[PDB]
Amino acid sequence: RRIQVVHAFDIFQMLDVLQELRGTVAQQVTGSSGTVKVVVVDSVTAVVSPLLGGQQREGLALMMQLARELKTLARDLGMAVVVTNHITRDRDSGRLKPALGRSWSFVPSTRILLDTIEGAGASGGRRMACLAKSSRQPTGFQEMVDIGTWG
DNA sequence: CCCCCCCTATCGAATCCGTCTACCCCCC
Known part of the structure; x- marks a missing residue:
């Protein structure tokens, strides 16, 4: 009951939802509980x-x-915001890069590029996690994350 | 001038290599 879900399929609906959230949390400055801290x-x-x-x-x-x-929203009201995205051309000219062009690249603060393993050990929950952009620590480190056995 | 984004299977070819023997009849 503490996880609130809203459906938005157009950019105007998403903008309205986020503006309503901003207004409600601005009105709820006096309160100390019930304010969402993570937005996904x-x-x-x-x-x-x-x-x-x-x-x-x-x-x-x-x-x-x-x-x-x-x-x-994230800066002023101290919320943790997490969004997803897709990849673009994997051809010889262009490496595996996030979508939405170059202009979107300056928006986020931390990038995690999930990937799947090939050959032996494929399928299941075995996914390779990497940190592309963090702007705080060295990047290019690859790890392992299992989801099938996790939760 | 500048922006973001992808596709799809095909034909047929080309012969080789020999083993194994059985079974007697009839008197002036």
């Missing part, structure tokens, strides 16, 4: 992916505004 977005790419494409510019502005409001 299941997929920020799926909502904004249809808005990209073409030679227009409103999609980039919308995603930048969403990033700015997320950053203001």
